[PDB]
């Protein structure tokens, strides 16, 4: 059998979670999951530590699934020891245990239900591709993930043929004392419509306050920001400009009963493959005393099978660093009131955003004519619309196309002369125009 | 009040000085010492951190080199357990670069520089010896990547780059494949940032690839000039050493003094909250802890046993001093010193690898070229 | 013409050479290649780098 | 001779707690050359707002 001890911290639906254990169907794998649920408040890390090892010596559990409601990052770090010292798999499904830590122990069994800062950066570029935003700017602090965040963005820019223009990679240091003038001096170089900020939640308010002193926080800008700044989406510090874009995990849909079910499944199917291919039951010493002599038995093999897991057609595959290869992310946008509303959904490198047009700006109708307005399918050489083309939609079947012609080149020259923005769209009701029963149809 | 500054240090004899160190600070509103030895077991080590906090309510924790030869993982039980409450922990004798990240080690300050800060020595040593083409032999571990990451940043400041940044898996027995690529490279300056075990494999292979002969330079840190690596290092290893890194008592006295100055800073403030009484139900983060940690970086010591003790933005040492060994006649003899701003070479000369008295250029020209052509009718 | 110019370059710069044709047989362009999802040069341009 | 003018923007003194709106008003200024006209006291206030 497989010993799994799902642990819940704080307020949670234990009865609902317990029902998922019955609904957990792994007869095909033949895992024999001995799932045990223990609920206890956060209290102290010694209690957190002593809850596992004491219970480890009681049932000789094979894996641990840890859930929490508190947003303390220190829970993830403490859970690495039990993953490393005891060589027992630990799943950070929810709460502070799901706060992704970039660097873990080289021998840790810890895994987390979260995206990496490189995964959040990649989807932040998919948002700009969908709405044909290509102007760039990056503002980072000395936070440890700043190197990985910028490196992923820069690599993804040069590895694709889509026109990407990065203006500046502005870096701001907060350790300076009374460095507001200095922090303004570097921040004054920002002259791009779109700013990709990466800093702590506290620093963003300081950054936005300094940008408030400039005043060019949001008027036509669209700041795009990772979930680190958003933090608890309930508490908005009111210094975040309206229109902020963030990439948060699917906390709205994946509740605790959903995540606990995947936690049990992931540990069980990993052991079954090892119990079949390697055919060796992992039975380590459950005692925590004199762990130096307990390093003879190593279960590094189970790490390989835990990485690659298939369950209900979902690639619930982790990384060697503990992220998720295929997480489910939602793009949250600040509304007029201080509220985060889900606008998008990213899964398997697909962006199923619900906003077809991002909300002077005016709408323009168009038709299909031979030398005047020619509509073409989306460009396959690099993606989106190539040079000398503008994006236009058509409804039947809402499809984004590329429009080009004599009339459009007139529109492009007029647009940057009258200084206005536009969004073309083709006609569905008809053609140029005809008065039928005193009604006008088509472009007119 | 009764401010507790108790530490968790091994070397029972050294803890005697800690009691004297605390008493000396009192003669300089009250500091109490509750030093406790290091638990050999990691899991038992973490519990004892807060269990001793129950009867002490300590304001900061000091961790030192244990009797065990692990030399790493020792501060992990004392950093995360204290980091839950944002209790600052002092790295007396730890040199691993993992503890330099604020995201993972939230409350940790180091009184010694990490191994990854040697690359600050190397980059400034280049201009002293006029070297620009180098080969990096970093390892795949985080420690190897940190040295490569910081060395590259300094190189980009000079609009220069390393010729190759060859990385090898730690614990690899057959490293000749990596060094095979490094042979055709024109740079004759080799910088090795591996551990003591991994250095032995590199040295053994480099000997049998004839890479230890004349005209080759080996820049190497402290780990690879001692232990197993020294017994296979070739002559002319331009090593490195710390003046008093292995001396605990040198650092405890300076570390205690630095916290004492911040204690005086903590005397006047707004809404000072005492640390948690124990590990029972104190889920609070000790709001005052970040204030204690923030003022602890800015607290610079005017003097001390090891000179001025300044803390970096990441908690590392600032303006440290390094000693430049040299494997002359199988004996590491200092042929230089670091004053914290520039390299001050000693009066004596350097015996370079291969027994060359003159300083090797460290560069070469291939002459033999590989030329790629396409089939074009008139050309 | 190119080889005759190459021989002159070697004499005036004192170097030897090893002339080998291009494996791809193409001069060089930047290509997407979705199989690896990476931009790289092909042929003569890809053999220099 | 080719002359182009960006803004003729006006801004107010007598308004109480007008610093927030006077900064908001100054956002429209993007031209590199400014032809300022105010009092000496108001110049520092404008410069400190532009500061």
């Amino acid at each position: 059998s497989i010993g799994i001890a799902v642990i819940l911290v704080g307020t949670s639906d234990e009865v609902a979670i317990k029902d998922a254990h019955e609904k957990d169907d792994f007869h095909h794998l033949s895992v024999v999951p001995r799932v045990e649920l223990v609920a206890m408040n956060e209290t102290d890390p010694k209690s957190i530590i002593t809850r596992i090892c004491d219970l480890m010596s009681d049932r000789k559990i094979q894996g641990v699934v840890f859930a929490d409601d508190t947003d303390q990052e220190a829970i993830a770090q403490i859970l690495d020891f039990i993953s490393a010292q005891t060589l027992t798999p630990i799943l950070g499904i929810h709460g502070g245990s799901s706060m992704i830590m970039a660097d873990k122990d080289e021998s840790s069994m810890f895994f987390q239900f979260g995206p990496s800062i490189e995964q959040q950066a990649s989807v932040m570029l998919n948002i700009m591709e969908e709405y044909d935003w290509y102007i760039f700017s990056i503002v980072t602090t000395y936070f440890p993930g700043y190197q990985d965040f910028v490196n992923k963005i820069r690599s993804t820019i040069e590895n694709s043929f889509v026109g990407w223009e990065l203006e500046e990679v502005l870096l701001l240091d907060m350790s300076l004392d009374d460095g507001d003038s200095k922090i303004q001096n570097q921040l004054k170089k920002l002259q791009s419509p779109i700013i990709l900020l990466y800093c702590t939640k506290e620093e963003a308010t300081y950054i936005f306050e300094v940008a408030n002193s400039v005043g060019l926080t949001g008027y036509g800008y669209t700041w795009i920001v990772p979930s680190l700044v958003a933090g608890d989406t309930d508490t908005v510090p009111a210094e975040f400009p309206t229109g902020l874009i963030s990439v948060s995990y699917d906390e709205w849909d994946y509740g605790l009963p959903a995540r606990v079910r995947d936690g049990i499944a992931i540990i069980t199917t990993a052991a079954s493959d090892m119990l079949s291919e390697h055919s060796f039951i992992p039975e380590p010493k459950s005692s925590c005393y004199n762990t130096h002599e307990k390093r003879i038995y190593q279960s590094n093999m189970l790490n390989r099978y835990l990485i690659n897991v298939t369950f209900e057609g979902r690639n619930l595959s982790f990384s060697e660093d503990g992220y998720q290869m295929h997480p489910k992310l939602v793009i949250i946008l600040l509304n007029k009131e201080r509220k985060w509303e889900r606008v998008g959904k990213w899964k398997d490198k697909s962006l199923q955003m619900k906003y077809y047009v991002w909300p002077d700006h005016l709408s323009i109708v168009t038709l299909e004519e031979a030398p005047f307005v020619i509509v073409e399918s989306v460009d396959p050489l690099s993606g989106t619309c190539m040079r000398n083309t503008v994006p236009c939609q058509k409804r039947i079947g809402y499809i984004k196309k590329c429009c080009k012609g004599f009339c459009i080149d007139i529109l492009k020259k007029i647009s940057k002369s009258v200084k206005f923005t536009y969004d073309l769209y083709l006609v569905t009701n008809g053609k140029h125009g005809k008065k039928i029963n005193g009604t006008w149809n088509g472009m007119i | 009040k009764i401010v507790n500054i108790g530490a968790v240090l091994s070397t029972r004899k050294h803890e005697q000085m800690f009691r004297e160190a605390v008493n000396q600070a009192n003669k300089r509103i009250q500091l109490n010492a509750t030093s406790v030895t290091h638990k050999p077991n990691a899991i038992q080590m973490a519990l004892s951190v807060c269990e001793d906090l129950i009867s002490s309510q300590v304001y900061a924790i000091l961790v030192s080199h244990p009797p065990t030869p692990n030399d790493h993982f020792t501060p992990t039980p004392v950093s995360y357990t204290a980091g839950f409450y944002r209790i600052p922990v002092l790295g007396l004798t730890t040199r691993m670069s993992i503890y330099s990240d604020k995201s993972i080690h939230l409350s940790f300050l180091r009184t010694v520089p990490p191994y990854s800060h040697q690359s600050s020595v190397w980059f400034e040593m280049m201009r002293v010896y006029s070297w620009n083409h180098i080969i990096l032999l970093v390892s795949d571990d985080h420690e190897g990547r940190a040295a490569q990451k910081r060395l590259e940043t300094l190189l980009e400041e000079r609009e220069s780059k390393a010729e190759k940044v060859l990385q090898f898996d730690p614990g690899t027995k057959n490293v000749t494949a990596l060094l095979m690529e490094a042979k055709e490279l024109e740079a004759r300056v080799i910088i090795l940032s591996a551990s003591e075990d991994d250095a032995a494999t590199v040295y053994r292979a480099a000997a049998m690839l004839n890479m230890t002969g004349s005209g080759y330079v080996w820049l190497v840190g402290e780990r690879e000039i001692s232990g197993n690596a020294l017994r296979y290092a070739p002559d002319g290893i331009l090593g490195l050493q710390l003046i008093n890194g292995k001396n605990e008592s040198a650092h405890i006295s300076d570390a205690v003094g630095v916290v004492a100055q911040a204690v005086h800073e903590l005397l006047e403030k707004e809404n000072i909250t005492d640390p948690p009484r124990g590990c029972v139900g104190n889920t609070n983060i000790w709001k005052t802890g970040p204030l204690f940690k923030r003022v602890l970086m800015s607290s610079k010591y005017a003097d001390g046993v090891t000179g001025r003790v300044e803390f970096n933005e990441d908690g590392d040492r600032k303006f440290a001093n390094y000693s430049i060994m040299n494997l002359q006649n199988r004996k590491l003899v200092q042929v230089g010193i670091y004053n914290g701003t520039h390299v001050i070479p000693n009066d004596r000369k350097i015996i370079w690898p291969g027994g060359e008295t003159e300083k090797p250029r460290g560069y070469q020209m291939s002459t033999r070229l590989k030329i790629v052509t396409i089939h074009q009718e008139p050309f | 013409f190119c080889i005759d110019l190459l021989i002159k370059l070697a004499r005036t710069m004192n170097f030897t050479y090893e002339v080998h044709l291009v494996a791809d047989g193409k001069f060089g362009t930047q290509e997407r290649v979705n199989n690896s999802n990476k931009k790289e040069w092909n042929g003569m341009m890809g053999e220099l780098l």
Side-chain angles (χ1 to χ4, degrees), chain A residues 1-45 47-385 388-444, chain B residues 2-101 103-156 158 160 162-163 165-172 174-268 270-276 278-293 295-330 332-379, chain C residues 1-37 39-49:
Chain A
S1 79
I2 306 174
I4 298 181
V6 47
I7 315 163
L8 321 173
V9 182
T11 72
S12 55
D13 310 343
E14 323 179 15
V15 182
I17 281 151
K18 271 306 290 162
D19 300 0
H21 308 173
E22 319 156 353
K23 285 178 175 178
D24 264 348
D25 300 343
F26 321 115
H27 329 74
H28 298 271
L29 295 145
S30 83
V31 295
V32 198
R34 190 162 37 83
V35 50
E36 316 140 5
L37 175 168
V38 46
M40 61 86 58
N41 319 44
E42 171 65 65
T43 69
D44 58 78
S47 65
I48 289 322
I49 292 167
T50 205
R51 184 67 55 118
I52 316 187
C53 40
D54 157 20
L55 168 145
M56 249 171 48
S57 68
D58 274 354
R59 302 101 183 269
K60 272 225 160 194
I61 49 160
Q62 292 214 4
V64 185
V65 166
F66 200 91
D68 187 19
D69 46 15
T70 36
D71 50 302
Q72 260 272 39
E73 316 92 355
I75 305 143
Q77 279 105 54
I78 294 154
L79 288 188
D80 267 277
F81 294 35
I82 307 86
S83 82
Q85 310 306 317
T86 88
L87 259 166
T88 48
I90 295 200
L91 266 306
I93 43 155
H94 188 223
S97 42
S98 83
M99 295 226 160
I100 287 275
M101 71 196 268
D103 197 3
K104 301 187 182 184
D105 217 354
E106 83 279 343
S107 50
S108 75
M109 280 288 154
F110 192 39
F111 296 105
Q112 283 164 322
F113 276 57
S116 63
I117 205 53
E118 317 97 28
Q119 278 172 338
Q120 277 168 333
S122 72
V123 51
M124 284 199 321
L125 261 72
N126 297 359
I127 305 172
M128 311 155 78
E129 286 160 1
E130 273 249 358
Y131 301 142
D132 291 345
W133 310 357
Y134 300 130
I135 305 292
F136 226 93
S137 88
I138 308 175
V139 181
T140 78
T141 51
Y142 263 50
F143 221 48
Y146 89 109
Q147 273 293 20
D148 297 352
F149 176 78
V150 180
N151 281 347
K152 168 60 122 173
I153 281 177
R154 280 228 209 80
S155 96
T156 47
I157 272 181
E158 66 217 0
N159 264 267
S160 66
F161 279 111
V162 158
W164 289 114
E165 44 273 11
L166 216 168
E167 275 77 335
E168 182 76 10
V169 152
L170 307 93
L171 183 156
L172 325 177
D173 164 49
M174 297 332 218
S175 82
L176 280 172
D177 285 356
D178 217 347
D180 312 347
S181 66
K182 308 158 189 174
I183 216 76
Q184 167 77 280
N185 255 346
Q186 202 139 23
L187 198 56
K188 267 180 308 228
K189 321 165 161 42
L190 248 187
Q191 271 165 323
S192 165
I194 282 175
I195 306 95
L196 263 61
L197 183 76
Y198 174 78
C199 48
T200 316
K201 181 185 227 329
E202 141 79 22
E203 274 171 345
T205 59
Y206 188 22
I207 279 307
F208 288 132
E209 157 207 283
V210 172
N212 273 319
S213 91
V214 160
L216 265 174
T217 84
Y219 284 90
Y221 298 162
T222 37
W223 289 59
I224 305 202
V225 155
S227 62
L228 169 63
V229 171
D232 270 329
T233 64
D234 317 275
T235 85
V236 198
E239 317 195 357
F240 291 177
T242 306
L244 213 80
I245 278 288
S246 272
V247 193
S248 53
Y249 207 59
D250 281 26
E251 312 283 325
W252 287 255
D253 273 334
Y254 263 50
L256 200 36
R259 294 185 205 213
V260 297
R261 155 149 25 93
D262 311 319
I264 321 291
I266 271 179
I267 318 187
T268 43
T269 182
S272 79
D273 302 358
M274 174 221 61
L275 282 179
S276 62
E277 192 257 358
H278 194 27
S279 78
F280 266 99
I281 311 181
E283 294 136 338
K285 292 192 183 180
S286 57
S287 44
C288 80
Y289 325 96
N290 264 329
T291 55
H292 309 289
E293 296 191 2
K294 292 155 179 162
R295 279 179 171 162
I296 322 170
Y297 297 93
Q298 287 185 342
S299 49
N300 304 354
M301 281 81 87
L302 211 63
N303 236 10
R304 170 201 304 103
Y305 322 110
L306 271 163
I307 289 321
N308 192 8
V309 155
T310 42
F311 164 43
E312 275 219 58
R314 289 212 323 275
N315 220 311
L316 275 171
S317 45
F318 288 140
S319 72
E320 279 87 357
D321 319 330
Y323 331 129
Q324 255 192 313
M325 279 314 108
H326 308 280
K328 303 203 210 93
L329 303 183
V330 293
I331 302 102
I332 50 174
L333 161 75
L334 248 186
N335 310 270
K336 190 38 209 148
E337 55 259 42
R338 306 321 285 239
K339 194 174 318 291
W340 291 98
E341 164 78 12
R342 327 160 51 190
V343 185
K345 169 79 208 207
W346 183 80
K347 191 43 200 261
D348 292 342
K349 303 290 189 297
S350 302
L351 191 42
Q352 41 265 51
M353 208 157 286
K354 74 121 158 178
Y355 269 15
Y356 264 101
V357 194
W358 195 247
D360 286 58
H361 193 88
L362 55 101
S363 171
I364 296 184
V365 200
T366 301
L367 218 76
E368 177 71 359
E369 205 52 61
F372 296 132
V373 277
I374 329 168
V375 65
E376 304 162 336
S377 61
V378 200
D379 271 293
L381 304 181
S382 67
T384 72
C385 295
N388 209 4
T389 59
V390 317
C392 48
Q393 83 92 17
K394 180 172 171 27
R395 186 51 188 193
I396 293 163
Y398 220 93
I399 164 174
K400 167 187 178 176
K401 308 210 192 69
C402 306
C403 279
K404 167 203 49 148
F406 177 86
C407 286
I408 299 317
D409 280 9
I410 286 190
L411 193 39
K412 297 219 295 317
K413 302 186 178 31
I414 282 180
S415 65
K416 44 172 311 173
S417 72
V418 199
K419 314 272 201 213
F420 72 101
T421 68
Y422 60 99
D423 48 285
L424 300 202
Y425 75 90
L426 274 71
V427 174
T428 301
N429 198 22
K431 33 170 53 53
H432 313 286
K434 167 84 154 307
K435 233 182 178 168
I436 47 192
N437 221 334
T439 58
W440 287 99
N441 63 340
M443 277 200 281
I444 180 190
Chain B
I2 310 299
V3 171
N4 220 301
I5 196 175
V8 192
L9 315 176
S10 85
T11 63
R12 176 43 269 171
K13 56 146 306 305
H14 266 278
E15 319 183 32
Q16 300 150 353
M17 182 305 278
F18 186 48
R19 321 274 184 195
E20 312 170 73
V22 162
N23 291 348
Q24 204 278 339
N26 297 357
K27 291 139 203 172
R28 282 278 326 279
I29 77 181
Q30 189 79 8
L31 306 184
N32 186 222
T34 174
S35 73
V36 50
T37 202
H38 282 205
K39 256 64 148 184
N41 319 338
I43 302 162
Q44 260 70 35
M45 193 30 206
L47 315 157
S48 71
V49 164
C50 80
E51 278 177 354
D52 303 330
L53 189 137
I54 294 171
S55 53
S56 308
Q57 202 159 345
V58 279
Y59 266 77
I61 302 276
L62 320 191
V63 78
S64 76
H65 144 87
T68 54
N70 59 305
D71 303 0
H72 163 286
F73 290 140
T74 304
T76 45
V78 315
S79 73
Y80 296 152
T81 51
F84 184 43
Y85 310 129
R86 293 308 171 281
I87 291 181
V89 186
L90 282 193
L92 292 193
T93 58
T94 188
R95 269 183 85 70
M96 295 294 177
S97 65
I98 170 72
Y99 313 99
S100 54
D101 38 40
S103 279
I104 308 124
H105 288 267
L106 319 89
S107 312
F108 200 100
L109 284 147
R110 258 206 230 96
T111 200
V112 280
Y115 284 137
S116 65
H117 259 289
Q118 290 159 323
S119 53
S120 48
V121 164
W122 291 330
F123 154 71
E124 145 196 302
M125 164 169 348
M126 321 271 266
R127 64 168 178 70
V128 179
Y129 293 9
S130 82
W131 282 330
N132 301 315
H133 320 276
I134 73 172
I135 298 177
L136 265 164
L137 263 283
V138 308
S139 50
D140 220 349
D141 208 281
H142 176 220
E143 191 49 80
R145 286 205 304 275
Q148 155 210 293
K149 270 185 54 53
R150 162 195 343 290
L151 184 43
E152 283 270 8
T153 51
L154 320 173
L155 290 185
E156 305 316 280
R158 281 219 284 193
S160 63
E163 169 146 82
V165 176
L166 297 111
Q167 326 204 358
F168 66 97
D169 203 62
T172 283
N174 182 261
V175 84
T176 60
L178 261 283
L179 287 159
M180 261 331 306
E181 154 161 58
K183 212 176 172 185
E184 301 56 50
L185 298 165
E186 313 301 314
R188 294 300 188 258
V189 168
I190 296 165
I191 296 180
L192 180 84
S193 90
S195 72
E196 54 270 3
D197 173 337
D198 316 341
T201 67
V202 157
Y203 291 158
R204 285 164 141 100
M208 52 146 278
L209 279 308
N210 298 330
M211 261 212 181
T212 75
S214 65
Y216 268 103
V217 186
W218 287 78
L219 279 87
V220 152
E222 311 167 15
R223 262 175 305 163
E224 323 93 321
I225 57 131
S226 34
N228 236 312
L230 172 128
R231 314 172 41 269
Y232 303 91
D235 80 305
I237 286 283
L238 208 152
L240 270 200
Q241 267 210 349
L242 209 48
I243 318 294
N244 43 27
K246 285 275 307 309
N247 248 359
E248 299 194 359
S249 59
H251 297 299
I252 315 171
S253 41
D254 295 325
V256 167
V258 168
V259 188
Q261 307 163 297
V263 158
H264 268 160
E265 172 48 42
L266 271 184
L267 296 193
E268 50 267 60
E270 307 158 351
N271 306 333
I272 293 150
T273 300
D274 269 38
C279 46
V280 177
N282 297 83
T283 324
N284 204 8
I285 213 177
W286 186 19
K287 339 317 294 308
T288 326
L291 323 172
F292 193 16
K293 198 199 154 76
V295 306
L296 203 37
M297 281 156 240
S298 56
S299 85
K300 55 206 68 51
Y301 220 132
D303 67 319
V305 177
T306 70
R308 296 174 62 79
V309 182
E310 279 78 19
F311 283 139
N312 205 17
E313 43 181 345
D314 40 45
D316 301 357
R317 262 306 286 268
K318 279 286 306 155
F319 311 132
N321 51 344
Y322 287 88
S323 97
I324 295 157
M325 299 294 118
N326 206 309
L327 203 47
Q328 292 180 355
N329 281 354
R330 314 302 282 146
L332 282 179
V333 281
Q334 153 175 344
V335 195
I337 212 66
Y338 197 178
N339 84 317
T341 45
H342 93 284
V343 181
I344 307 180
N346 201 273
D347 321 327
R348 307 178 314 121
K349 318 270 183 35
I350 281 138
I351 279 139
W352 294 104
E356 179 193 7
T357 89
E358 203 256 342
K359 159 174 104 77
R361 153 75 173 158
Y363 187 62
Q364 260 210 342
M365 279 266 217
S366 204
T367 70
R368 168 147 300 237
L369 294 206
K370 302 189 154 194
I371 286 155
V372 53
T373 65
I374 214 185
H375 169 42
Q376 224 57 30
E377 175 163 354
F379 298 96
Chain C
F1 175 32
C2 285
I3 284 131
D4 254 2
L5 154 75
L6 155 68
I7 295 160
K8 161 71 146 64
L9 282 185
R11 290 190 306 111
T12 41
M13 258 169 312
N14 295 321
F15 71 82
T16 71
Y17 45 90
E18 280 169 348
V19 186
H20 71 266
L21 298 168
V22 189
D24 299 46
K26 279 135 181 176
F27 290 87
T29 38
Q30 278 273 29
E31 309 272 47
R32 262 313 278 123
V33 187
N34 289 342
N35 324 297
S36 65
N37 176 41
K39 253 211 229 168
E40 68 312 349
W41 295 91
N42 39 6
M44 226 154 87
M45 255 317 258
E47 292 208 354
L48 246 189
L49 304 169

